[PDB]
Design a protein around this ligand. Structure first.
Ligand SMILES: *[C@H]1OC[C@@H](O[C@@H]2OC[C@@H](O)[C@H](O)[C@H]2O)[C@H](O)[C@H]1F
Length: 187
């Protein structure tokens, strides 16, 4: 298992694992595009497989994701210059993420609400930093499908949410002060 912060490649896929609560979450790297997680009374973590360089790809996944508390099943990544953390949220637990509402985008058989938020003095790919988060949050839950990431990126940019140079992009599980499991397979 992965149980400490790291990135790398496994079976052809980039992966990232991060937590502020070492010991509360584990990630197993499965075959091909597969991984799984298990957490118990965690702080915050984000883990997943995907790509070292994000962009306008189509991301096809399916997942076991039936959380009891606060957690997200979400496309997730970063840009630099500007430094931005971004989310395309497919499902969630007790809490549906929200923020400053910008409008909607209709893609991949759903409609998503566009939100913007900001994290202050927070962990990032660039260390402790302040940075915006951009969100698309599906209006109803789903745990399999295709995400046309470009359709989100363009819609955000059309709403003045500017992305910089892409860093990593993963189909992520995120947990927060919760317990649970996920098993996610990138097609
Ligand atoms: C979004 O998710 C959690 C956290 O992002 C981590 O920042 C540290 C970096 O090394 C990891 O790769 C990221 O997953 C960020 O604070 C939050 F806003």
């Amino acid at each position: 298992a992965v149980t400490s912060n790291q990135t790398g490649y496994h079976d052809g896929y980039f992966y990232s694992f991060w937590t502020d609560a070492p010991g509360t979450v584990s990630m197993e790297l499965g075959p091909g595009g597969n991984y799984s997680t298990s957490w118990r009374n965690t702080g915050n973590f984000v883990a997943g497989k995907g790509w070292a360089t994000g962009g306008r790809r189509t991301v096809t996944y399916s997942a076991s994701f039936n959380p009891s508390g606060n957690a997200y099943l979400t496309l997730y990544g970063w840009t630099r210059n500007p430094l931005v953390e971004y989310y395309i949220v497919e499902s969630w637990g007790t809490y549906r993420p929200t923020g400053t509402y910008m409008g909607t985008v209709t893609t991949d058989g759903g409609t998503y609400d566009i939100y913007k938020t900001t994290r202050y003095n927070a962990p990032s790919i660039e260390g402790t930093r302040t940075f915006d988060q951009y969100w698309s949050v599906r209006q109803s839950k789903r745990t399999s499908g295709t995400i046309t990431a470009g359709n989100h990126f363009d819609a955000w940019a059309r709403h003045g949410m500017h992305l910089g140079t892409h860093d990593y992009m993963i189909m992520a599980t995120e947990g927060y002060q919760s317990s649970g499991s996920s098993n996610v397979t990138l097609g």
